[PDB]
Amino acid sequence: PIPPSAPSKRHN
Amino acid sequence: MGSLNQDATILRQAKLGLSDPAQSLSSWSDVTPCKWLGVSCDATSNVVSVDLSSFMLVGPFPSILCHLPSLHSLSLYNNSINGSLSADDFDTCHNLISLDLSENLLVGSIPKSLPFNLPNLKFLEISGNNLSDTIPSSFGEFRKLESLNLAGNFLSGTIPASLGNVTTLKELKLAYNLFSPSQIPSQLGNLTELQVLWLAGCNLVGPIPPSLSRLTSLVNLDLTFNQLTGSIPSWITQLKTVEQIELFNNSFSGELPESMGNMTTLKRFDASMNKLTGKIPDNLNLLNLESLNLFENMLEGPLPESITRSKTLSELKLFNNRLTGVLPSQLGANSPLQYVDLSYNRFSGEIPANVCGEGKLEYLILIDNSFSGEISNNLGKCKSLTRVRLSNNKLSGQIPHGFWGLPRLSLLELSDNSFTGSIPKTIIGAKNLSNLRISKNRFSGSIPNEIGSLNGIIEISGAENDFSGEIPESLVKLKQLSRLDLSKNQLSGEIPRELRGWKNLNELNLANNHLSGEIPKEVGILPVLNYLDLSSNQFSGEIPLELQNLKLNVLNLSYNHLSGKIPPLYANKIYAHDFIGNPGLCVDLDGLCRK
Ligand SMILES: *[C@@H]1O[C@H](CO)[C@@H](O[C@@H]2O[C@H](CO)[C@@H](O[C@@H]3O[C@H](CO)[C@@H](O)[C@H](O[C@H]4O[C@H](CO)[C@@H](O)[C@H](O)[C@@H]4O)[C@@H]3O)[C@H](O)[C@H]2NC(C)=O)[C@H](O)[C@H]1NC(C)=O
Ligand SMILES: *[C@@H]1O[C@H](CO)[C@@H](O[C@@H]2O[C@H](CO)[C@@H](O)[C@H](O)[C@H]2NC(C)=O)[C@H](O)[C@H]1NC(C)=O
Ligand SMILES: *[C@@H]1O[C@H](CO)[C@@H](O[C@@H]2O[C@H](CO)[C@@H](O)[C@H](O)[C@H]2NC(C)=O)[C@H](O)[C@H]1NC(C)=O
Ligand SMILES: *[C@@H]1O[C@H](CO)[C@@H](O[C@@H]2O[C@H](CO)[C@@H](O)[C@H](O)[C@H]2NC(C)=O)[C@H](O)[C@H]1NC(C)=O
Ligand SMILES: *[C@@H]1O[C@H](CO)[C@@H](O)[C@H](O)[C@H]1NC(C)=O
Ligand SMILES: *[C@@H]1O[C@H](CO)[C@@H](O)[C@H](O)[C@H]1NC(C)=O
Ligand SMILES: *[C@@H]1O[C@H](CO)[C@@H](O)[C@H](O)[C@H]1NC(C)=O
Ligand SMILES: [Mg+2]
Ligand SMILES: [Mg+2]
């Protein structure tokens, strides 16, 4: 579905 | 009795207009309609609410449900309602207070007549469809609307300024549409009751309008994924009930509002992937903070000690900035830290000893800093760890014994430090280990046999250490092993002969050791091997002809004691550098064998 309204999940 | 009859007939008529492959409406086929699945009645036995959420119903919007004279709430959330919305569909729905059409298959435009046909609505959702064309300007005529969610459609044009007239709105969700590049309309600042503004992925340009400072009841402001410019305005700091600010992936510049520290209610703040400069505000009293993400900016200065006042902090991602100084020594002692990623900064001093103090830490990612000293023995007991990346620092001493065998640890990356010691046999515990990355250290001793018991291993990368003794025969039945790199060590003995276990082995790199014996023939039967470097060893005997099966990006057998002829496939002079320094070897060209 649509991305939630929440923090970016990006990480190393 | 009369109302039960009316209700039952209208519900059945509506159901006849739908396909029900899941048999969700089997109860609508003895019992009063007030007890049918999804149906709620008032005290006079009139249907007031129909909620068919997640029922897998297929077909056009069931207009007939609006003929129920007391129907106030209708939800068709998460079905396969399809076709388009017509003006007519809603002609009779004027008693509705709540209408949820989210997560269906609707296409075409929103009818311009919708507000006129649905003038009593407080709640409208049509999120997650394929709606196209513009949001009608007539939407400014809604007199009672409290929440509007059109997120996740293909709506285009720009956000209509007339939505600023709907001053009863408390939630405005328009995220993830196909609007033309435009500014946030100034008129949205008239929506002084707003608690939620979600305009992520709306092709927004320019600054956050100053009028939005009138939205003093904001709880969640989410403007992610746009090209908004200028400062993050300091008025966000004075929002007395703000819980979430999401501004990541924009073009915000300047500094974080200096008084951010007093936002006691704030739970989540993400301004990652912008062009922010200056420092992280200090005197933080961020009592409710759970997540702080500021990665990929140009922030400088330290992580303030006052971050440790955030006793519910679980996520801290500050990577790719210009942050400096020692980390607060107490970081994590008093917080349920779960994900910590401070990579690509200029932090120095020791890793805070209680970063996993509360036993919740999953990601410890600190690549490319100047952390020094030893890893605390505490981390050796941090059993929640899955992903550890400590590479390219100034760390030293021995790794804690338990660190090698942590039960959920998937990635263990320590490369390019000055760690010493032998890998213990308790590595046998690392049941979930996928990638061991420990190159460029001072590890000594033999590679322990137990590494061969970890069936999930895909990578063993240990180049540039002081490993000695033999390659354990056990490595040869790691069925998933993709990359084996033990170059630049002091390894001795031979390569095992039976290698059909290595069905996924893509890289075999053992260059610069003291390895002896023959190159096994089965090296050439490895189905996905593309990199083979056995150079600078003492391999003897002939180069197996099976190597001609492989398509090798890298083939290097130089500086060995090999003899016989080069296999014919590599006879051309462009491959010569693959075989230099084998006095016993020659190439067959035109009859004679040439050095
Ligand atoms: C940071 O945020 C920006 C937004 O400010 C974001 O840029 C967007 O990226 C997406 C995904 O990469 C882009 O979407 C693409 O658009 C092009 C056409 O312009 C096409 O390649 C694709 O469109 C398809 O759309 C349909 C799918 O529903 C297909 O059926 C159709 O055939 C097309 O192929 C693709 O979706 C988007 O264009 C930009 N948006 C803007 C406003 O620039 C960026 O990715 C983010 N950056 C990071 C690093 O996260
Ligand atoms: C949309 O509805 C579908 C169908 O009811 C939901 O899928 C079910 O999800 C539950 C778990 O919540 C499982 O028990 C079922 O096996 C699923 N069924 C099918 C057919 O997939 C789905 O959860 C709903 N989606 C949303 C976003 O709410
Ligand atoms: C709603 O739009 C989406 C996204 O464009 C469609 O989903 C699929 O789109 C991809 C290409 O991006 C295709 O491979 C599929 O054929 C599409 N799904 C299908 C045909 O089921 C989706 O089709 C659209 N839905 C409707 C009802 O038109
Ligand atoms: C094959 O491997 C040898 C080393 O085993 C390579 O030779 C080294 O190359 C580097 C250049 O980056 C030099 O610093 C070393 O001094 C060289 N070592 C020796 C012993 O000469 C060689 O370059 C590799 N050949 C190919 C074609 O990849
Ligand atoms: C609605 O869906 C059904 C089944 O997928 C299909 O047969 C029907 O024609 C659809 N209607 C429209 C307008 O797409
Ligand atoms: C609605 O909004 C438009 C656009 O900002 C404005 O010009 C107009 O006066 C407003 N009308 C009503 C009836 O609220
Ligand atoms: C934070 O400080 C500024 C003054 O520096 C003030 O305007 C704002 O109202 C304060 N916020 C809270 C939540 O107390
Ligand atoms: Mg401080
Ligand atoms: Mg490595």
PDB file of C-alpha atoms and ligand atoms in Angstrom, chain B residues 140 143 161-162 165 187, ligand 6:
ATOM      1  CA  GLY B 140     -14.196  23.979  -0.036  1.00  0.00           C
ATOM      2  CA  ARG B 143     -19.395  22.594   6.306  1.00  0.00           C
ATOM      3  CA  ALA B 161      -6.701  26.715  -2.182  1.00  0.00           C
ATOM      4  CA  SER B 162     -10.398  26.339  -1.357  1.00  0.00           C
ATOM      5  CA  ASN B 165     -12.355  27.186   3.705  1.00  0.00           C
ATOM      6  CA  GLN B 187      -4.816  29.277   2.595  1.00  0.00           C
TER       7      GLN B 187
HETATM    8  C1  LIG C   6     -13.117  29.617  -0.540  1.00  0.00           C
HETATM    9  O1  LIG C   6     -11.719  29.676  -0.888  1.00  0.00           O
HETATM   10  C2  LIG C   6     -11.430  30.532  -1.995  1.00  0.00           C
HETATM   11  C3  LIG C   6      -9.968  30.337  -2.404  1.00  0.00           C
HETATM   12  O2  LIG C   6      -9.071  30.741  -1.355  1.00  0.00           O
HETATM   13  C4  LIG C   6     -11.784  31.963  -1.573  1.00  0.00           C
HETATM   14  O3  LIG C   6     -11.417  32.899  -2.601  1.00  0.00           O
HETATM   15  C5  LIG C   6     -13.286  32.048  -1.259  1.00  0.00           C
HETATM   16  O4  LIG C   6     -13.631  33.340  -0.743  1.00  0.00           O
HETATM   17  C6  LIG C   6     -13.739  30.996  -0.237  1.00  0.00           C
HETATM   18  N1  LIG C   6     -15.200  30.912  -0.228  1.00  0.00           N
HETATM   19  C7  LIG C   6     -15.947  30.393   0.756  1.00  0.00           C
HETATM   20  C8  LIG C   6     -17.436  30.414   0.536  1.00  0.00           C
HETATM   21  O5  LIG C   6     -15.487  29.932   1.782  1.00  0.00           O
END
